Every structure is written in structure tokens, then in C-alpha cells.
């Protein structure tokens, strides 16, 4: 079973299923979004091949005592962003793209959408699923908003820190984002 379409289908269903079960408790306690994002999603996403890009050539210099700390703090950072992101829930659709034959490459872009009558015109969010060698099943490693990436803006922004400070600089400073929500829902 390597068809990504069926995986995305079941993923959307399970996500909105587990999401529908809570309405007042989540806004009474934000500690549930950071939980449910780990309850699912994360088995489908890859961390190594993602967190390797933001480093750059400096990867060839990282000591084995430093790599694991960054690799551990990266997930703890990644949770909060997607946690805060989930602040909408208007019962919106998700019309998947139609089927297509054998992929002619080990890299494939797939597109979804989202529509609701209560909001602005819709928007598309491409995804990328990578066809690895012998991993059998495949994972996703990126997201594209709309002509804008999410690994591009951060590949160079955390820049001069790499030149002057080092990996040690990015460590700890990554986790130092606290645990918060918004009071404007």
C-alpha cells in the first residue's frame, strides 16, 4: 500500500473526526490542540529529512553530541506552531484532486482545497510526498501556502546566527518560544 491518495483521504477523515468531538473544552483549555496534533498527523510526517535542510552545509561539521539535541527540540518547536494554527473550524470542505496513473518520478506534488460559504474565496495548499528507496510507505515533508513555501523563508532568515554563533545558538533559542494561545477567537 503506497498510494498517497488513500492515505490523505483517511487522514482528513480521522482528523476532522477527532476534531468534531470537542467545542467548548478546547477554547476552555488550549492544551488539547497540542495533544491531538500528536495523536495523529505526526505518524505521516518525517522529521529527519525536514530538519536536515534548515542546517545547510554546516551539517558536515555537526558533532554527534549536538545533532540529537537539535533533532529533539525541533519537534517540540513544531508542535506549537500547528497548535496555534488551528483556530477556525467553520465546517469547510476538502475536495481532493482526482486520481492519476503511475508517477513518472520519485517526487510528486499533490493538491487539495477548502471551501466554506461563510468566508472569503477559497485557497489551494499543495503538498509534497517523497518516494523514498525501501521505506515502503511514504511521508510528507513540506507545505506550500500559495506561491509561498515554509522551508524557504526560514532557510535564510535564521542566517547570521549560523555564521557568528553556531548550532549552539539555534539550540535553546529554538525551544524558547513558551506555551501560549490567542485571546482573539
Amino acid at each position: 500500500q503506497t498510494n498517497p491518495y488513500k492515505l490523505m483521504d483517511e487522514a482528513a477523515q480521522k482528523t476532522f473526526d477527532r476534531l468534531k468531538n470537542e467545542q467548548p473544552q478546547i477554547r476552555a483549555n488550549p492544551d488539547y490542540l497540542r495533544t491531538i496534533v500528536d495523536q495523529e498527523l505526526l505518524p505521516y510526517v518525517q522529521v529527519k529529512y525536514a530538519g536536515a535542510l534548515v542546517l545547510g552545509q554546516y551539517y558536515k561539521s555537526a558533532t554527534p553530541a549536538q545533532r540529537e539535541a537539535y533533532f529533539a527540540a525541533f519537534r517540540e518547536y513544531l508542535k506549537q506552531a500547528y497548535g496555534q494554527a488551528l483556530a477556525m473550524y467553520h465546517g469547510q470542505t476538502y475536495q481532493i484532486a482526482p486520481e492519476q496513473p503511475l508517477g513518472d518520478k520519485t517526487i510528486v506534488p499533490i493538491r487539495v482545497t477548502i471551501i466554506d460559504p461563510n468566508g472569503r474565496p477559497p485557497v489551494r495548499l499543495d503538498f509534497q510526498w517523497r518516494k523514498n528507496s525501501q521505506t515502503g510507505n511514504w511521508q510528507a515533508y513540506d507545505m506550500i501556502a500559495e506561491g509561498v513555501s515554509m522551508i524557504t523563508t526560514k532557510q535564510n532568515e535564521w542566517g547570521t546566527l549560523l555564521r557568528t554563533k553556531g548550532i549552539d545558538g539555534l539550540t535553546a533559542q529554538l525551544k524558547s518560544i513558551s506555551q501560549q494561545k490567542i485571546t482573539l477567537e
Partner: protein
């Protein structure tokens, strides 16, 4: 001029206004120019063939290639981004005649100004 040239291929799906013989640059300095642009009769997807000099020739494949604009009323060009080398996961320095795997779409105006501020 010295011309020990390499050639490479890439595919897209929307290229804005990138006409022929435009420059290509890394980090802000020029290293080559596009050559031949065409369309594909099997599925209709634009395909570009570019060429590189021989002085710089140590790029690992895990790299990106995007399109952007210059100034406020200038001409578009192709920016590049270098990655990392690591065994098993991603090796194979580019040999002549290969294709760049990654790509990113073109930035369109009007669309976003209609989207936001609605």
C-alpha cells in the same frame, strides 16, 4: 570567453514572463544563462534547458530552484539554493545530462490582492 559548458534540464507549469536568454544567479552573482524553452506534446508542461560554466561544479542534488522578480519594475530571473551532502540519504553530485528534481511555481499578482483585503 571560456566555454566548457554543461547542460541541464528542468520542468515547470507556469513561468510568468521569463523570455529567452535571461541570466541565472546564485547568492546574487551571475553563473550562466538559460538556453532553450519549449512545450511538451504529451501533457502540456513547459520545459527549460539551461547551461553552466565549468569553474563551479560541485553542487549536491538536494538543491532548489525558484523564480523571482528584480526591483519593482524589472525582469524576472532564476534563483538557486544549495543543500547538503550525506551518505545513503542523498549523494550523487550532478553529472552532465541530468535533470534538477525540485521546482517551485511562479508568483502571480492580482490573485492575492483579490484574496486578502476582501
Amino acid at each position: 570567453r571560456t566555454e566548457p559548458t554543461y547542460t541541464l534540464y528542468a520542468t515547470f507549469d507556469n513561468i510568468g514572463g521569463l523570455k529567452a536568454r535571461s541570466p541565472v544567479s546564485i547568492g546574487g552573482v551571475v553563473v550562466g544563462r538559460v538556453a532553450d524553452i519549449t512545450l511538451d506534446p504529451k501533457t502540456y508542461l513547459p520545459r527549460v534547458t539551461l547551461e553552466i560554466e565549468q569553474r563551479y561544479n560541485h553542487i549536491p542534488d538536494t538543491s532548489s530552484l525558484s523564480i523571482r522578480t528584480s526591483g519593482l519594475l524589472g525582469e524576472q530571473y532564476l534563483a538557486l539554493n544549495v543543500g547538503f551532502e550525506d551518505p545513503e540519504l542523498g549523494t550523487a553530485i550532478l553529472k552532465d545530462g541530468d535533470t534538477i528534481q525540485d521546482t517551485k511555481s511562479a508568483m502571480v499578482l492580482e490573485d492575492l490582492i483579490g484574496q486578502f483585503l476582501y
